[PDB]
């Protein structure tokens, strides 16, 4: 269709956060971040095509040379390899990084594949994106049973309230070039803030994107394969080296996976209107590493692109949410400013704020207190009134 | 009977309104 | 441990007389206490045989009453005929019901008196309303009255249920007592002489109404049941078809918020995707017309329940609809006449106004699909095609039931329908002539069978000779094998034991896509399953004939071709009373080895051809097509978001584009939902159809009084999981009355919970639903050892048939057509194997099973047997149990609901652990021993036989496998290779799975590969005895699962099992003597 | 040809299989019948000539 | 504490036992339970104080 | 060896609780070999370790 | 994996098949000459007796190529797998011994 110049259209108000709700409104920011996370889960594509889950596990089992009928006992390598977890991980990572929601890890130490797939995770994803105790536990485990044992080093002496994470304090001790530079990359991986199209964005390194980080990973892991384990037995060495060969054999698919995550992430970042700050949150999202291992092991020659209509949907949803947000802000600002300039002194500026929070149809005003509302009023006092409302008031 | 049936038909128009259709209808 | 009390109360209530005496019998695994049980037995028999009071001894042997185990209860009560009415008069104080003859279209389909339709018995037939089940109407009435009487004093919500069901049973019994009860004969048929003065359709209506009112737990259930029971008394042809029809539209109204996906055949990967519901307006007008018919029939409450949901169109109130969709199929079958049921199909509108551009493409696509199937084996010259004759001749057992023909095996006469037996007969008398395919014409038209299913039309079944099967077999097996890995054959994409049963629509549902789904079950008399369909296949065979160089293969292909020639013109014997009609029907239906996949092909070609016509007006990319028999669905994606007008115009174009090929259809297009025969989806949530009648059957099987109770219990469990829930105590009453046996006119025996719930060939149900029970005790072990000794029985009919001359000739001809010069070393093996496929013939099975039940009964009467050490499952579990320790756990909820209609405990388990994700071989089909059998045959051999065969030396394995049609070189190679040692473990896996219903019922729906279930099952690893750690982890999983099901709460486990016991059990492994009944399985997908 | 069962017994001996592992070596035995050896011998020559 | 059963899982998986071999390492698991760790922890300190 | 930090914790904890329970003593405490002894199974130590 | 290298980082539409690109990374005469021969194995279009013919190299016909093959496979058998375990070595080397 061509539309004439007799036609019209209304522009949304896409003015950024006048309130800085990521500055000490943590109870509201948790709900907001959860809302955007769960919204983002509804638009990340499903993994339409995979490799079968039994035609893989027999190849894996024979690669691992396991006792027959241990498949139903699941000697810890083989626990939670299934789909219904791979898609869950694929969905969770992307939706969290988009929403900037911190995610905690629930794994097991008997399962050495979980520690191995945490490397790929902690490489492709920045470490300031997780929550601290989880990756502290995971890095500690990795160091204690894959890395320091590969050079006869001691186990560790880690400290609870330590400014540094185990990969940082491990980067300087051990002497191997490959693993050292890998850990350097990991430790100094972090987001890059940058404003594009008006919106702030947390962007990746530009080496994770065009996937070559995985080559540093393979270099480190291959070195550790090439070592000997003098301090430790043959079964231990055998178990570890097979566990990382199972990832080496999936290398190219991992590279493609990394590039696909980076691509979908930036593509969906494009459809954002409200600036996206990197701030920790009250509530988290669980991530079993068996749900990573699944994704990292059930994948290949199967691309998933978000349909354009989903993108347009997500963009219009965020636009409408943002416009509503600014508009209701403008309402509240008009009445508040007016109340202060008309000397209305017996008026408790709460029900206005109750209306403001009710029109944002995500909160539970029945169990949010009066103090947050009054602080919100205190910030709203210092906002310029929009031109329409100001002129009508004057 | 038919008062509630016709009201079901009418209220099942207001509900589930598509956006492209109302655009093309405004245009048309 | 509660059933036996209900048994006692049933006995006390039904008999009630001074003369009615009750005689328990007990047993104990300890000798001294067993002799005291024997004593009690003895003294009881005497006291019974002297009219002395029994109540005194019951104190003296208190120990037996408290600690020993019950078997059964006898009952001495005389004829005392007509006591059912003498009890029933009180529950019939309501008003009786009047029929209305001007409701059903036909005359005989009204519920009028028999004499108004069959004055003479010589033209009478009870088959239009035969329940076809070995259980009485009187049984049902007695059961209902016993439930009502015992629940006559409760004061709770139960009483609110009781008043409702009491009113329903009042409504029924007023109608019944108006005339009386028809009396069953010994065969559970109902003769003319009782029905002569009574309504013809009273029995099915009565039973169906009892089943419905026994499945009432809520107000809406009462409304629905009262609104169907009172209208199903007159309407018997346009009722289940009516209320079950709008559902197909309703699924296109439910917004998706959260979704399920399929990857490979039971995988899931949920999605939080939201999808709206872009429904057009004219389908509401259609729906409105359907509700106008619904109200016009005499329905008031259930349109209102269907009407108040549309105000919100929410998915939380939606299970009511699903519940309603199951209340339509528990009203009974529409057992009309063969003639009028054929004429549902035999109305034809063949026209010289269809396209020609369409049929030629259609024909070609069928040709091309066939060529894709058959290019590789026809070219590489596979053994199974050259020797197709021998292949079909081995695989006759997996065929349909041929027409009855008079045989003679030496000194008998048989009217068997099994075609293997037909072959045995025709070889002897010079009549076996498989190369010359018979015609099907005026000189020899075709018989029929009737494929029924309520709420729909009657489909027809060909009943052919035995040449047609032989021709079609090998080619169809390679076609199916090809379709195992092809996605689009929904009937056959699997990994050798599964189907894509959770669908493959939900991948690409979005705001831009739509899906057209379509029922194709009426497309048998259509103009596209005649000439073009057959000729495409003929063309493909011509190409394939030019795609080989061997002559046996070209002959086989020419025979298959000649079969299609004969099927292009085919007439059909149909009686009507005395005279016989024969109609030209040169088209497709079921009753053939070829019909299924070939219809799938033809529907695929049809939809591929139609879907390239919507392309004249829309741009879309065909993402997925699926075709399975009596339905088919195709999803398609657009350049933009969907509107109402595109749906409407697409629907009109589809309808008219089917009309251009002269093909009727109720075309159905949607965005979120589908409806098909076996399942349906709304809002990204799979529901299912619970339409399996329990107290009324489709046709008359062959099972006993015993096994039909087991079948009914499996169907009960299934329907419960689907959503349709019946009150379990009624079902238990039916099971006891169907396992009750008359030893004399007044003696009758009733077994107990500990005989019926034990893993054997006699298992019927379980003490707690969704949970098989095992035995940690002496006593369950004791009787399991006893019953395995008795399960193995004989059939004199089979023994005498295998000793005639014709069978011997058949074995000899098999041999010399396969291999020769070992006439006394393998041929006897082949006879023993042929015995394994005579058992399909039903009377042999009846002889054998009646023998098993009588042998069982002659130690239910008398005391028990020690059975001489024969190892079974409970022997193993007895030893695994004493090194466990349970502790209270607490699992969270992290798995999504997608079957709301389940009971809340099973759903709580699904909502805490995962749903199953693999399907491990019940048959051991992927096992290297079975991939020979699936290469040279189709034959099953039961996992009992394989588990036994592997336990023998390396010599008789060769004999047993070669006897199953396999050649000698590959068997020798299998034994030399030492692959059976790589297959002991898989066979034992499948064996133990079959023993414990792991792939049969509720346990099919659960994830044993879970990380959440595993962290509770903390059995440390030892290694190099894999079977023990395997069974330990499995049994510990079963413990946790059974505790969850039976109590809701969770538990952990721990087993520091000593190596000594590991080794003691390793030797007890491959000497197991255990068995599970075929009749006990409950496949959730039927 | 050499006796299939004998030759494959020789293969088994030279592989030293185990009845208590999965052992990728096992898959080497997949499809060692006659009529396919001949088929491959036929397929190659007819392809290279045609 | 760590749960006895999970810790025994970890120890068993780490030692690589063998059910058809008289291992010395099988005896490492005898008496690992709690109610003894408390008792030992209490006994040592009580004896060193007294 | 795979319980290093936990064993450091255990050693410090024993030492702490001992030296804290020593403050609640009044009679001067001698290091002398007594008659009767407390048995001590090392399985109960492993447990603690 | 025998000479202790990465798996590969191979493009779908690479104008070189993997043996061609792999011909140059390794350093061992037997395997490299073998891969060279394999990559440069192609028909000879020659007109004999009036008809064109797709003739083989005349080093495959006289069976000598198998000696290159066995030299490469023997010099792989003698290697260790620094990255991969010894059971996996055992499986692979065993397999190539069966042939």
Coordinates of N, CA and C in Angstrom, one line a residue, chain E:
Chain E
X1 N 25.7 -30.7 58.1 CA 26.8 -31.5 57.5 C 26.5 -31.8 56.0
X2 N 27.5 -32.4 55.3 CA 27.2 -33.0 54.0 C 26.4 -34.2 54.4
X3 N 25.5 -34.6 53.5 CA 24.6 -35.7 53.7 C 25.5 -37.0 53.5
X4 N 25.3 -38.0 54.3 CA 26.1 -39.2 54.3 C 26.0 -39.9 53.0
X5 N 24.7 -39.9 52.5 CA 24.5 -40.7 51.2 C 25.1 -40.0 50.0
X6 N 25.0 -38.7 49.9 CA 25.6 -38.0 48.8 C 27.1 -38.0 48.9
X7 N 27.7 -37.9 50.1 CA 29.1 -38.0 50.2 C 29.6 -39.4 49.8
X8 N 28.8 -40.4 50.1 CA 29.2 -41.8 49.8 C 29.1 -42.0 48.3
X9 N 28.1 -41.4 47.6 CA 28.0 -41.3 46.2 C 29.3 -40.8 45.6
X10 N 29.8 -39.6 46.1 CA 31.0 -39.0 45.6 C 32.2 -39.8 45.8
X11 N 32.4 -40.4 47.0 CA 33.5 -41.2 47.3 C 33.5 -42.5 46.4
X12 N 32.4 -43.1 46.2 CA 32.3 -44.3 45.4 C 32.6 -44.1 44.0
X13 N 32.1 -43.0 43.4 CA 32.4 -42.6 42.1 C 33.8 -42.3 41.9
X14 N 34.4 -41.7 42.9 CA 35.8 -41.3 42.8 C 36.8 -42.5 42.9
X15 N 36.5 -43.5 43.7 CA 37.4 -44.6 43.9 C 37.4 -45.7 42.8
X16 N 36.4 -45.8 42.0 CA 36.3 -46.7 40.9 C 36.5 -48.2 41.4
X17 N 35.5 -48.6 42.2 CA 35.4 -49.9 42.8 C 35.2 -50.9 41.7
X18 N 35.2 -52.2 42.1 CA 35.0 -53.3 41.1 C 34.4 -54.4 41.9
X19 N 33.2 -54.8 41.5 CA 32.4 -55.8 42.2 C 32.9 -57.2 42.1
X20 N 33.9 -57.5 41.3 CA 34.4 -58.9 41.1 C 35.9 -58.9 41.3
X21 N 36.3 -58.4 42.5 CA 37.7 -58.2 42.8 C 37.7 -57.9 44.3
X22 N 38.6 -58.6 45.0 CA 38.8 -58.4 46.4 C 39.7 -57.1 46.5
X23 N 39.0 -55.9 46.6 CA 39.7 -54.7 46.7 C 40.0 -54.3 48.1
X24 N 41.1 -53.6 48.3 CA 41.4 -53.0 49.6 C 40.6 -51.8 49.9
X25 N 40.2 -51.0 48.8 CA 39.6 -49.8 48.9 C 38.1 -49.9 49.3
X26 N 37.5 -51.1 49.2 CA 36.1 -51.4 49.6 C 35.9 -51.1 51.1
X27 N 37.0 -51.3 51.9 CA 36.9 -51.2 53.3 C 37.0 -49.7 53.7
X28 N 37.2 -48.8 52.8 CA 37.2 -47.4 53.2 C 35.9 -46.9 53.7
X29 N 34.8 -47.5 53.4 CA 33.4 -47.0 53.6 C 32.9 -47.5 55.0
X30 N 33.6 -48.3 55.7 CA 33.0 -48.9 56.9 C 32.9 -47.9 58.0
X31 N 31.7 -47.5 58.4 CA 31.5 -46.7 59.6 C 31.6 -45.2 59.3
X32 N 31.3 -44.7 58.1 CA 31.4 -43.3 57.7 C 30.4 -42.4 58.4
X33 N 29.2 -43.0 58.8 CA 28.0 -42.4 59.3 C 28.3 -41.2 60.3
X34 N 27.3 -40.3 60.3 CA 27.2 -39.4 61.4 C 26.7 -40.2 62.6
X35 N 26.6 -39.5 63.8 CA 26.5 -40.1 65.1 C 27.8 -40.6 65.7
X36 N 28.9 -40.7 64.8 CA 30.2 -41.1 65.2 C 31.2 -39.9 65.0
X37 N 31.0 -39.2 63.9 CA 31.7 -37.9 63.7 C 31.4 -36.9 64.9
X38 N 30.1 -36.8 65.3 CA 29.8 -36.1 66.6 C 30.6 -36.7 67.7
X39 N 30.5 -38.0 67.8 CA 31.1 -38.7 69.0 C 32.6 -38.6 69.0
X40 N 33.2 -38.6 67.8 CA 34.7 -38.5 67.8 C 35.1 -37.1 68.0
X41 N 34.4 -36.1 67.4 CA 34.6 -34.7 67.6 C 34.4 -34.3 69.1
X42 N 33.5 -35.0 69.8 CA 33.3 -34.7 71.2 C 34.3 -35.4 72.1
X43 N 34.6 -36.7 71.7 CA 35.6 -37.5 72.5 C 37.0 -36.9 72.5
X44 N 37.4 -36.4 71.4 CA 38.8 -35.8 71.3 C 38.9 -34.6 72.2
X45 N 38.0 -33.7 72.1 CA 38.0 -32.4 72.9 C 37.9 -32.7 74.3
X46 N 36.9 -33.6 74.7 CA 36.7 -34.0 76.1 C 37.9 -34.6 76.7
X47 N 38.6 -35.4 75.9 CA 39.8 -36.1 76.5 C 40.9 -35.1 76.6
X48 N 41.1 -34.2 75.6 CA 42.2 -33.2 75.7 C 41.9 -32.2 76.9
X49 N 40.7 -31.9 77.2 CA 40.3 -31.0 78.3 C 40.6 -31.8 79.6
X50 N 40.0 -32.9 79.7 CA 40.2 -33.7 80.9 C 41.5 -34.4 81.0

